[PDB]
Amino acid sequence: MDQKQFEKIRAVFDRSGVALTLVDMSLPEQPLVLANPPFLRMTGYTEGQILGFNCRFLQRGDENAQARADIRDALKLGRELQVVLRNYRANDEPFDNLLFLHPVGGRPGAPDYFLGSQFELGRSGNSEEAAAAGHAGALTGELARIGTVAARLEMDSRRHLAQAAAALVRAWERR
């Protein structure tokens, strides 16, 4: 996909109010090539340390067995996916992470990039379900400005993505 389209994704990332990451999928390691300020603000890292590496560095040891396996399928398959990950800030302090993965660019089942958006659980008090839904609606806004969600489908896509995020938080709150 063009640098025209790539620079447009960059601009969306810069102004976005949700944490956004974009990994290159043509490489084996799937390195970070974009990471916006809301994401840096969450994680404690800065651009220097993270661009060019795989996003696993947010995990410690081995604690996300079932969830990394679901990622690895969704990624190889080119499907979107919402999953919760035990993650850690740069100061090692922990946080659960509702991660949204969206295929970007390329062709079906082989996207040029994957987009990832992280919602921090535990920060929203009594309304994690609403707050995750909120996150999913804001993310849908960004996906439309990028071109992945067609305008004619933006409303129903937003509805189904907020619903997925709320169901996920309901399970997580029952773990």
Ligand X SMILES: Cc1cc2nc3c(=O)[nH]c(=O)nc-3n(C[C@H](O)[C@H](O)[C@H](O)COP(=O)(O)O)c2cc1C
155 interacts with a copy of itself by CB under 8 A: yes
71 interacts with a copy of itself by CB under 8 A: no
Q: Give all strands of the β-sheet with 94-104 in edge-to-edge order.
A: 32-35, 20-24, 113-120, 94-104, 81-88
Count Cα neighbours of 50 within 13 Å in the Cβ-side half-sphere.
21
| Angle at the Cα of 14 from the Cα atoms of 84 and 79, rounded to 5 degrees | 40
Burial of 125 from C-beta contacts in 10 A (0-12 / 13-18 / 19+): exposed
Count Cα neighbours of 87 within 13 Å in the Cβ-side half-sphere.
25
Q: What is the rounded distance in angstroms from the CA atom of residue 13 to the CA atom of residue 129?
A: 25
Alpha-carbon distances of 159 from 85, 134, 163, rounded to whole Å: 23, 11, 6
118 interacts with ligand X by CB under 6 A: yes
Which option in Cl ion, a copy of itself, ligand X, none does residue 48 bind, with CB closer than 5 to 8 A by kind? Answer: Cl ion
121 interacts with ligand X by CB under 6 A: no
Which option in a copy of itself, Cl ion, Na ion, none does residue 121 bind, with CB closer than 5 to 8 A by kind? Answer: Na ion
User: By CB under 5 A, what part of segment 121-140 binds Na ion?
Assistant: 121, 123-124, 128
- Nearer of residues 32 and 133 to ligand X, judged by Cβ: 32
68 interacts with a copy of itself by CB under 8 A: no
- Best CA proximity match to 67, nearest among 39, 43, 101: 101
- Nearer of residues 3 and 174 to Cl ion, judged by Cβ: 3
Which option in a copy of itself, Na ion, Cl ion, none does residue 118 bind, with CB closer than 5 to 8 A by kind? Answer: none
124 interacts with Cl ion by CB under 5 A: no
Alpha-carbon distances of 57 from 50, 71, 110, 147, rounded to whole Å: 9, 15, 24, 29
The CB-of-42 to Cl ion minimum distance in angstroms stands at: 4
75 interacts with ligand X by CB under 6 A: yes
# residues contacting Cl ion (CB under 5 A): 17
Site of interaction with ligand X (CB under 6 A): 21, 23, 30, 54-56, 58-59, 68, 71-72, 75, 85, 87, 97, 99, 101, 114-116, 118
